[PDB]
């Protein structure tokens, strides 16, 4: 209920956040379900906008 | 002074807001992509259209 509270502008920052934590794998595997359980409640809930905004860095982020 | 309408998607629960004021993710009607987290005053549900005098401000908490 406190993760749907944020605007979409922070979600575009939030994907750049997890784009950086993929680089530090020690942060990743030590917090692997919580990173997993947060993207997949956001990108469900903020699906229609992230799929409809076009930005070739976002394709390079999500890959 | 053009006015941009917006349709309500999801009322926000558990956010700590001042009584009387409720917090709502709206969707722009004229372009169904965007969203903006605005506050209402009166009683609001989903699937009703809301009137915005200004688009670009995005309302935060009112303590």
């Amino acid at each position: 209920d406190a993760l749907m509270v944020m605007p979409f502008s922070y979600v575009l920052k939030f994907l750049k956040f997890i784009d950086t934590v993929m680089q530090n794998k020690t942060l990743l595997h030590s917090h692997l379900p919580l990173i997993c359980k947060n993207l997949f409640f956001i990108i469900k809930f903020n699906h229609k906008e992230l799929v409809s905004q076009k930005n070739e860095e976002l394709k390079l982020q999500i890959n | 002074t053009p006015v941009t309408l917006a349709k309500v998607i999801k009322v926000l629960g558990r956010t700590g807001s001042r009584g009387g004021v409720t917090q709502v993710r709206v969707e722009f009607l004229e372009d169904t992509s965007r969203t903006i987290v605005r506050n209402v005053k009166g009683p609001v549900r989903e699937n009703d259209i809301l009137v915005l005098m200004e688009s670009e401000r995005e309302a935060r908490r009112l303590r």
Binding site: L3, M6 | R60
Partner: peptide, 11 residues
């Protein structure tokens, strides 16, 4: 004291 979820956002 901030309400949670907001304090995610400015952090």
């Amino acid at each position: 004291s901030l309400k949670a979820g907001e304090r995610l956002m400015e952090a």
